[PDB]
């Protein structure tokens, strides 16, 4: 009845607000229905906005993601006579790099790794993906756990503009923002490791 597709890459998140969108082009383009499940092909995730883990539009939202949430989730995509079930491994880690090095990011998945081209005007991104109901407040950026304060760096909402990339620009970057969902405020901090090409 439904074609099983296995996602080869694991998605990692800190124990804080997290959202993953069921965007799998070309299958999710056009008139299709999307249903999120939590390690089941029969019982879906809750649709109650007040649930800690719930389906918000095409997204699975964790407010917040916490220890015990790691596992396999399923996005069932149904079109006009067509069914696909994506098995997605979402994994939570407990701590942030600037607080402690223990129990943090277990591996450098693609999302936590970015590159800056030496001598070029380049940019970094947050990897802060949330549905429209999660309004992101002012975004602050850090380099090696200290707020960025340099002529070549410019915060531009969810992007960090970097002028004339130098070799000293290698290091860990992070972006922090206040997330506002249903009148409640939560904090989100996302890190990245940047290497200079």
């Amino acid at each position: 009845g439904c074609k099983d597709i296995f996602m080869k890459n694991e998605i990692l998140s800190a124990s804080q607000p997290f959202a993953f969108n069921c965007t799998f082009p070309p299958i999710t383009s056009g008139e299709v229905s999307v249903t999120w499940y939590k390690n089941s092909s029969k019982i879906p995730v809750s649709k109650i906005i007040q649930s800690r883990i719930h389906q918000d539009e095409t997204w699975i939202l964790f407010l917040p993601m916490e220890w015990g949430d790691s596992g396999v989730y399923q996005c069932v995509i149904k079109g006009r006579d067509s069914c696909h079930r994506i098995h997605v491994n979402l994994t939570v880690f407990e701590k942030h790099w600037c607080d402690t090095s223990i129990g943090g990011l277990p591996n450098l998945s693609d999302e936590y790794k970015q590159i800056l081209h030496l001598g070029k005007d380049d940019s970094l991104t947050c990897h802060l993906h949330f549905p429209k109901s999660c309004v992101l407040g002012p975004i602050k950026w850090y380099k090696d756990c200290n707020e960025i304060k340099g002529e070549r760096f410019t915060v531009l909402e969810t992007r960090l503009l970097v002028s004339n990339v130098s070799a000293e620009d290698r290091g860990n970057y992070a972006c922090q923002a206040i997330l506002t969902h249903s009148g409640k405020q939560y904090e989100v901090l996302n890190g990245i490791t940047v290497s200079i090409t």
């Binding site: 597709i5 296995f6 996602m7 080869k8 890459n9 799998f24 082009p25 693609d110 999302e111 990897h127």
Partner: peptide, 14 residues
């Protein structure tokens, strides 16, 4: 099989 990214997805036959 899929390899998922924010701006794109890598599909292969399974």
């Amino acid at each position: 099989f899929v390899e998922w990214x924010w701006d794109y997805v890598x599909x292969s036959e399974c």
